[PDB]
Symmetry: D2
Subunit: 296 residues, 4 copies
Amino acid sequence: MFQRSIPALITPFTKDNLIDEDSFVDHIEWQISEGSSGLVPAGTTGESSTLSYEEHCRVVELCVKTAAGRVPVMAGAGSNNTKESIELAQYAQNTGADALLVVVPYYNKPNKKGLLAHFGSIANAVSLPIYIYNNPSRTVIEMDVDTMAELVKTYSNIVGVKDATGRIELASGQRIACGSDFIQLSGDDSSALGFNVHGGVGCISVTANVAPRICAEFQKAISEGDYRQALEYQDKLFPLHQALFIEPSISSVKYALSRLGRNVSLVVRAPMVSILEKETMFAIDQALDHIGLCAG
Amino acid sequence: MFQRSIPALITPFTKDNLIDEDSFVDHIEWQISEGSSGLVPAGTTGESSTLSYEEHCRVVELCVKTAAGRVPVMAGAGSNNTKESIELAQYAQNTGADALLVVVPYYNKPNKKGLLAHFGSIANAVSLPIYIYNNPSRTVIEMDVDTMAELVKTYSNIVGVKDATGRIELASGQRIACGSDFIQLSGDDSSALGFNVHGGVGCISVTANVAPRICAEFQKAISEGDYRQALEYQDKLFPLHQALFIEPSISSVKYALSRLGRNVSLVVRAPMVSILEKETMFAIDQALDHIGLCAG
Amino acid sequence: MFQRSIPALITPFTKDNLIDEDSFVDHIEWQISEGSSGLVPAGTTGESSTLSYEEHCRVVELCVKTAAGRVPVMAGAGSNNTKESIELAQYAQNTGADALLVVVPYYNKPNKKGLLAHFGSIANAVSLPIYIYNNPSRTVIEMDVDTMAELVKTYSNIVGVKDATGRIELASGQRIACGSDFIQLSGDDSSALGFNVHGGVGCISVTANVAPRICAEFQKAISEGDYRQALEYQDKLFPLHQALFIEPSISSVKYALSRLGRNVSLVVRAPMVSILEKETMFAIDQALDHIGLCAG
Amino acid sequence: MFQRSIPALITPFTKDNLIDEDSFVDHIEWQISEGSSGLVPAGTTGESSTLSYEEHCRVVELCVKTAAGRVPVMAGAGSNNTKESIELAQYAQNTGADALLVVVPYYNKPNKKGLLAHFGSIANAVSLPIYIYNNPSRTVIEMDVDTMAELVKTYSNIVGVKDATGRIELASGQRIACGSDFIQLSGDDSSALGFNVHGGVGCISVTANVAPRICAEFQKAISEGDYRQALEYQDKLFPLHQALFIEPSISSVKYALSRLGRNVSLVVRAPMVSILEKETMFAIDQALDHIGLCAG
Ligand SMILES: N[C@@H](CCCC[NH3+])C(=O)O
Ligand SMILES: N[C@@H](CCCC[NH3+])C(=O)O
Ligand SMILES: N[C@@H](CCCC[NH3+])C(=O)O
Ligand SMILES: N[C@@H](CCCC[NH3+])C(=O)O
């Protein structure tokens, strides 16, 4: 259901700090037309941390309606509060999302029993498929392979992982412990190539916001087994992947999209800031031009 | 204003998962009569992550009202969303809190510019004194000493730090960069002793929830320069400091409080769980026995 | 020159703690006959830390003589003392090694200028090709991509890397910064598959000591672009890769070889110990049997 | 026996890269007359990694002879090769050293069983007191408190620790597990103050090479319980503690000594380099000026 290049969509804001709904709808249409295979609204890259409950729901709602069944929608339902996750998960189901992305809780650092209680409570509260989002670089704690396998064995609708660890040996361990039917998606653009050869089938991607067509061509080469061609795309994309997280990727992606002529403002919500260093903007501009993305 | 032993208060819940207001008031009264010198409600140990906005405000309001000016109240106003932090901070000011505890944003990983914008926006929106809560073991990012000093120089109401790093050399760096008028409080029970000899003046403490009198006597001896007696207290308290974070401190503290016979239920909110391993519970019982506070 | 499966050879010892030269010669012959493509004597897995200078030289000498030109020999010349590295490097050249493996210095933590002085002094002292061995999990410091590229640009005989980081995004960065002619070899068995699709051409391998034939078949599938078959081998090998470093791989490899009927004693040199926990031996035995390696 | 300020002595070299014996003797004499209470020759700050076996022994012999029983001598006998450690330890005993400093093995990463075998074998081969040097920032592995306590319980000549972790809570754990007769010495200049109030009795110090008198006055004030005066010294010394490890401490200390006008050349041994960045040198000059020891 979810495979190849799946953008973790930005949430564009107006000059007055409201949701820029027109810009968001335009962004989704453009992503679909350039070859993105699925959509993740209201995730980390969507600045879900700085959305209200109502805005978060509206972002998921708009994405589902705009996709109109052409591509599947995996709604962000991540929280460090299980009660809030269930409410976001039930909202997404009732509005027509195809699946849920649920991050390992951040800041309060549950132990293994807490991870089982968190993901099990969410799984019992909806019937949608659930992807575990494992990202210790943001959550500190890491779900281990034993816990992940127990959850897959216990709950039929825990079906996959967004693995942002960048340690691709874990993809082998997850494939063996959880089964080859467990759906593994890379959560790290720069290692998504090797992640797929270890058993992944796609990437929930930051860079796809900015370069959706090449990102899709890259994942298509992989799924066709043309790994020589996939490595050519990797060499082209790698500098952009890297330049987009010199500073926080939220503001770097919006900077790049604005520069490319997309109708996306630079506005982000504190504690993100839209001011980038000149050296950062230079690195992004050079990586964009290497790929050849400026229409002008 | 804030010195010696300051509990990071637990938030007790009823069996039906409401705030147990009677238990909370009783805990505060007991804390004050056993010698705690201040109170931090609705912090990390207070399970702020799983309180609603309404419940968070209620916990702060009820602490301020109960304390009634007897000891100063430093309200938790931490969030990874600057707008939410401003709203919690202004509610705490309006309800009568004496100061604010503001954690470095978690999960979304702002850069230094983002930290300046976050703490600056809060400082601009209230007149209360603000304490920076630096805890990279939960937030991943760490505020560095240049950033902390710049905030202190820029905003007269950024007055201190809760330093949970446990790396005591930072207390010297912060003392030199921010000045000796900068109020440093340990955020790490096990190294609070060394933190004060490097320039700290107290501890925002997990263990004080369970053993307020002995923690207060410990901080009193340091304040009086009786560091020989303080080491004796360190040796009695250290096993309990350590036993309370074998598993998450929230559940460990509430278990210890029930073991002491206080009117605190074991209920915590998911993703936290109240069930502790048998070996954890026995480690806590033995450390409590060692301070006589049970068996003897 | 170096490609596919290259064992980091153990150094077997007698009951009386001398070099077991017969066992070592037998091990090399067997490796060559099972398909290993190159040899690394007197590296980390060869217990180079506990060899005298004279033993180290003798191990390199024996390996070169035994290989007799059938496969190339990359002699370990690693030290945290540049003077010692030059002496080991010149010995290896003069005895007929085909190349050198030079680890980033351990324990004394040189800075970038020290890495340039170390690798440049060695490169100027021999004419053999040199592979940089980057392994921060043992050395703490990590050579960065800029330093590695500068060394490749400055010294024509610095030609490759054994990359033990297990972070395969670095293979993309090294390929771009150093060129596609820079020879990248995985130093991490469990991620060698994805390392090759990012641009690696082989693996200097711990596990190849124990399962040389499957390890060679695995690397041959990769070099033929049969990545579906390579993933089948990965699933078979991954449990063995992992079980061999539950405890130090030196003693785990020797345990496994002894169990398989090879003429290799369990003897290792302190601070390694040959005693393994029963759970470790069980995990190794199950992984060996899954692969089907016991002749009996 | 070992207390207060104990320099981890540099090893000066002549312009022709021999041991500068006259400079070494002069450094020791000066150290003793400025109030250092003990001496550690041929340690990490002594560049033990780049000394030959013969030179290492010579450095220990010359220190013992120069000291002449005036202050006790704790000889570096660290190696990652147990056999080498035994040989250095027995040479130090035979030449007249008073104790031994033995680092946790680096690079080859023994497990706990290996640590017991390493330190047990050394303890069995000498009658001198042995101090465990725990420094995971250089060795990666850390000896845990149960292992340290088991070694202390098992071997009567394992008497103390040089604890370079800088995590002061470990001093309390070691004090409780190993007993208050266990001799704890800070291995981290910047946190030595807090380490002693937690139970330490001195510091094996890098900074003492450069400022022996003030370091001795600092440790004297702690010994006398004048922790107010000790904090004043902390504030004067901390910028120099920090300036001496911007770049590797070896070269930084020798640069500071030349800046003071001592007869110490800048020569260090590769992979260390003597060239320091201009900003590093100025940070060192300013910190020296701040303790008046130059300009005033
Ligand atoms: N800032 C809070 C609330 C976000 C709620 C909507 N996603 C958090 O990151 O958990
Ligand atoms: N769970 C969210 C919202 C909590 C808001 C009330 N304290 C967070 O931890 O940021
Ligand atoms: N044990 C020392 C010497 C080994 C010399 C022969 N390889 C080291 O690891 O550097
Ligand atoms: N360089 C080797 C040998 C030094 C032997 C004399 N100290 C090591 O650091 O282990």
